[PDB]
Structure formats: structure tokens, C-alpha cells
């Protein structure tokens, strides 16, 4: 493994248009190379267009559509915006790499899915240990800066389906080379 191979990405968020801060994450390409590559290519959007979706493979413009207090925030659905869409750069969904990293710490980044090998683009950031997710969800990165923006988003008022009343937008994203 090489810590040198670990890349960095960011998510500039806005809540109802107001600047909320930047989230900087460290991806672990030395432990989840396939997964992390998906994430970074999605932040920079340099992977083109969805083979199935058709829409651009880019988190930019997508939202954080679901949030749970004392738990996590979820987003990355850039094709439906409701949690039923999203697509990886590899065309459609891709497989679960070795579940090496766990949700034994707060603020780790993980892949949201709908069962085995169903990784699309949707991901979540926890704000608490979520061991009941270990081995079921692939943990690829970790927040190293701006964990307060996550906390700010997590406690936003939501509707009955846990969607934030305000529009939480990833106004911009990319890599920190």
C-alpha cells in the first residue's frame, strides 16, 4: 500500500444558495482503487457521459437528498435526484471491492447501494460510527477538512422522507492536486 497514491477531492456546498463551506476528503486508492477512481472521476467529471444514463457523470449540480440526525448525509444521485438514480464511470454499476475499511469512526465516506455489487454514484458521509454498515457498504475515503459543513447539513430541517427542506447543492467539485 502507498499513502502516496491517495488523492484528494472536494465538495463546495450551498444551502438555498448560501455558501456553506468546503468538504475535503482523502480517498484511499491503496485500499479501494476501483471505488476511489470512480469518486474522483465523478468529482472532476472527466469521465464523460453515462453509458446507460446519458446524463453527465459529474457530481457537480447534484444534491444531498437525504439526511438523518446523528447518522449520515447522502447524495450523488445525479440522474434522478431522489435516490433511485446515479451511475458509475465504469458503465452502470460496479462490484464491491474488499470491505477493508469500516465505519468505526465518524466522517468516513462510503458507497450507498441497494444490495451486493450495486455501486452507482450515490455515496454517504457519516457523522458517527456505523458498524452495522460494515461489510455491507464499501468505505473508500475520509473527511480531513470541513467536517463542520457535514454537521451543518446533517441537522437541517427535513420533510417526512428525510429530504432537506432547503436545497443542498454541490455547487462545485473537483480534485486537489
Amino acid at each position: 500500500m502507498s499513502k502516496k497514491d491517495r488523492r484528494r477531492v472536494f465538495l463546495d456546498v450551498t444551502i438555498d444558495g448560501n455558501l456553506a463551506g468546503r468538504i475535503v476528503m482523502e480517498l484511499y486508492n491503496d485500499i479501494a482503487p476501483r471505488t476511489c477512481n470512480n469518486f474522483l472521476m465523478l468529482c472532476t467529471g472527466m469521465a464523460g457521459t453515462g453509458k446507460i444514463s446519458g446524463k453527465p457523470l459529474h457530481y457537480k449540480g447534484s444534491t444531498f437528498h437525504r439526511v438523518i440526525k446523528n447518522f449520515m448525509i447522502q447524495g450523488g444521485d445525479f440522474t434522478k435526484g431522489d435516490g433511485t438514480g446515479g451511475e458509475s464511470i465504469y458503465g452502470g454499476m460496479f462490484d464491491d471491492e474488499e470491505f477493508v475499511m469500516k465505519h468505526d469512526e465518524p466522517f468516513v465516506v462510503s458507497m450507498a447501494n441497494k444490495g451486493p455489487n450495486t455501486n452507482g454514484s450515490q455515496f454517504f458521509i457519516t457523522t458517527t460510527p456505523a458498524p452495522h454498515l460494515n461489510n455491507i457498504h464499501v468505505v473508500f475515503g475520509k473527511v480531513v477538512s470541513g467536517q463542520e459543513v457535514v454537521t451543518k447539513i446533517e441537522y437541517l430541517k427535513t420533510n417526512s422522507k428525510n429530504r432537506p427542506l432547503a436545497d443542498v447543492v454541490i455547487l462545485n467539485c473537483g480534485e486537489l492536486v
Binding site: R66, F71, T84, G85, N113, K114, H132, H137
Partner: peptide
């Protein structure tokens, strides 16, 4: 409850 899925959301 506390799950993070894409499509079939549970409690």
C-alpha cells in the same frame, strides 16, 4: 431506521 440504500428505502 438507519440504512443508506438507493431505491428501496427502509426505516
Amino acid at each position: 431506521x438507519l440504512l443508506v440504500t438507493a431505491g428501496l428505502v427502509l426505516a
